[PDB]
Amino acid sequence: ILVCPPLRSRAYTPPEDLQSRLESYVKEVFGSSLPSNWQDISLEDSRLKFNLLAHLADDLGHVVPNSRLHQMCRVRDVLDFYNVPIQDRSKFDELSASNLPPNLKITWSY
Amino acid sequence: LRNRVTDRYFRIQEVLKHARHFRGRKNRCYRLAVRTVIRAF
Amino acid sequence: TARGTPSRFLASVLHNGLGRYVQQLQRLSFSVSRDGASSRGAREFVEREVIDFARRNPGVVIYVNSRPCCVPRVVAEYLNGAVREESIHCKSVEEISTLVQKLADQS
Amino acid sequence: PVRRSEKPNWDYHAEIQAFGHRLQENFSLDLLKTAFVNSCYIKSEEAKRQQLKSNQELSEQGTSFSQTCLTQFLEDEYPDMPTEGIKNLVDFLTGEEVVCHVARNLAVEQLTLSEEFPVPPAVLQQTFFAVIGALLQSSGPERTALFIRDFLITQ
Amino acid sequence: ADNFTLLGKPLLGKDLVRVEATVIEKTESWPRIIMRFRKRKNFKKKRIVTTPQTVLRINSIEIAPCL
Amino acid sequence: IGIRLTLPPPKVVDRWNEKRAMFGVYDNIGILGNFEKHPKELIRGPIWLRGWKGNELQRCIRKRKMVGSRMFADDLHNLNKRIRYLYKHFNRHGKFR
């Protein structure tokens, strides 16, 4: 019998040193000799793309979806995607966390 | 006998609630009532 | 028809507007559903417009009840003990805003 | 008839805040709560616990200010009426029917903590004058005199 | 007022008289029936309207010495 | 009074039956199976209505032509009368000529 690890959340804050971890990761996958504009290295090679995106997903806990895998053409696009923050919260919690005036009361009978 | 009418009571009740304050059989019989609510309007 | 309906004279609640104007709307109860396609517009109203309305009307208490229902509704309770229940079923956000502001303006 | 507290959609603190805001008066929250809680409610809850501050100070302060304030307005507007009539007009304005009508249409009855529903007229009058006393303690004599002028000279 | 009145031709002066009103209600009328019927021609039309309405309270009427 | 005084018994429906969960399966068998099979012969029903629509008169003619031999006597007589009536109506009556 195999035990299920607990369900992960989708809340993702981008780390402050995202640039330096991306520098590290592109150094282990794409090699030591950098082109000076490291932004515009293509991800047309699917093996290198898998290595980079799998390393980033395994480390940062956030994976690019299949609807955006074709859009991640460059490491600049990868950096943009990992800079975009997403949040996981029930929207009863969203409406409560929004600054409610003292005459507005919300009940959640669900 | 598929697709029969089931809210005919409520249609009749609309016309009769406009016909309620009348005199005679025209406040309760739908035919005589609907011939008089039209004239009232 | 006037002859088959009640009638009344022009009046205010408590000589309203003489010394000061008091908003006669007291409570608004919003029965909305989470998964109702009929309640979609009410859901958008709760997302966007109910906070600004509640800030613009500090004298009105707005309760929002998210519970499973087929017809989303609003109950307007007025200071003279009046109750007015309206269906917001399959209404868009601007129609719901117009209706709620109408309820606020009513006595 | 069942009181609005036992009716489903209710929250007392929000109702108190909206009462103050729709009356456009900067009430003190604790003073308004003590102006709405009555002694019969205390005795009933004591019996229920068997199975805090009343209205009385705020009620007497509000009643005394109401008498003095209404007497001053009436004898300034109408200097040629004598004392018996001025007193009786003040008694009409502070009487049971007028004060209970004003309190009911200002939703004092919904916010009144008592033992019996509907609220007895003496209890409603005492609670209304306790609200007047709380306003006198919170805002000042000129502002609560404007309040008295509005909600009783309009009657 | 009592003992005197003033007549404009056709309107009085704004320096002479003011009227002050207060918007106190914005409501709608009770539903009004508009119904058309012509006999032996199958002519029958029904419409419901609710005209908007505004209740104003006239607070004060003030006159000024300008005659 | 033609209206129920009590609520009807609740009509619970299971959306995940064999039939509901597998409706539409193999309906692309021709375009996904080298055209060996046709949806018209996936259709199950009367033998005279498999991959053929028709109107009422055409349905009656097709039924009499296909299964008229092995048909009951009064049912055959009714079908013949229906064909005669439908011929007369469709060929002689109507607004548009």
UniProtKB/Swiss-Prot annotation, chain A:
Coiled coil: none annotated. It comes from the Eukaryota. GO terms for biological process: mitochondrial translation. This is Large ribosomal subunit protein mL50. Keywords: Mitochondrion, Ribonucleoprotein, Ribosomal protein. Belongs to the mitochondrion-specific ribosomal protein mL50 family. The keyword Protein transport does not apply. Component of the mitochondrial large ribosomal subunit (mt-LSU). Mature mammalian 55S mitochondrial ribosomes consist of a small (28S) and a large (39S) subunit. The 28S small subunit contains a 12S ribosomal RNA (12S mt-rRNA) and 30 different proteins. The 39S large subunit contains a 16S rRNA (16S mt-rRNA), a copy of mitochondrial valine transfer RNA (mt-tRNA(Val)), which plays an integral structural role, and 52 different proteins. It comes from Homo sapiens. One of its GO terms (cellular component) is mitochondrial inner membrane. The keyword Hydrolase does not apply. It is found in: Mitochondrion.
Swiss-Prot record, chain B:
It is found in: Mitochondrion. It comes from the Eukaryota. Belongs to the bacterial ribosomal protein bL20 family. Component of the mitochondrial large ribosomal subunit (mt-LSU). Mature mammalian 55S mitochondrial ribosomes consist of a small (28S) and a large (39S) subunit. The 28S small subunit contains a 12S ribosomal RNA (12S mt-rRNA) and 30 different proteins. The 39S large subunit contains a 16S rRNA (16S mt-rRNA), a copy of mitochondrial valine transfer RNA (mt-tRNA(Val)), which plays an integral structural role, and 52 different proteins. Interacts with OXA1L. This is Large ribosomal subunit protein bL20m. It comes from Homo sapiens. The lineage of its organism: Eukaryota, Metazoa, Chordata, Craniata, Vertebrata. The chain holds residues 10 to 50 of 149 of the full protein.
From Swiss-Prot, chain C:
GO terms for biological process: mitochondrial translation; translation. It is found in: Mitochondrion. Keywords: Mitochondrion, Ribonucleoprotein, Ribosomal protein, Transit peptide. High relative levels in skeletal muscle and testis. Lower levels of expression in the heart, brain, placenta, lung, liver, kidney, pancreas, spleen, thymus, prostate, ovary, small intestine, colon and leukocytes. Expression is coregulated with TWNK. One of its GO terms (cellular component) is mitochondrial large ribosomal subunit. GO terms for molecular function: RNA binding; structural constituent of ribosome. Belongs to the mitochondrion-specific ribosomal protein mL43 family. Component of the mitochondrial large ribosomal subunit (mt-LSU). Mature mammalian 55S mitochondrial ribosomes consist of a small (28S) and a large (39S) subunit. The 28S small subunit contains a 12S ribosomal RNA (12S mt-rRNA) and 30 different proteins. The 39S large subunit contains a 16S rRNA (16S mt-rRNA), a copy of mitochondrial valine transfer RNA (mt-tRNA(Val)), which plays an integral structural role, and 52 different proteins. This is Large ribosomal subunit protein mL43. The gene is MRPL43.
Swiss-Prot record, chain E:
GO terms for molecular function: RNA binding; structural constituent of ribosome. Keywords: Mitochondrion, Ribonucleoprotein, Ribosomal protein, Transit peptide. The keyword Transmembrane helix does not apply. One of its GO terms (cellular component) is mitochondrial inner membrane. It is found in: Mitochondrion. The keyword Transit peptide applies. It comes from the Eukaryota. One of its GO terms (biological process) is mitochondrial translation. Component of the mitochondrial large ribosomal subunit (mt-LSU). Mature mammalian 55S mitochondrial ribosomes consist of a small (28S) and a large (39S) subunit. The 28S small subunit contains a 12S ribosomal RNA (12S mt-rRNA) and 30 different proteins. The 39S large subunit contains a 16S rRNA (16S mt-rRNA), a copy of mitochondrial valine transfer RNA (mt-tRNA(Val)), which plays an integral structural role, and 52 different proteins. Belongs to the bacterial ribosomal protein bL21 family. This is Large ribosomal subunit protein bL21m. It comes from Homo sapiens.
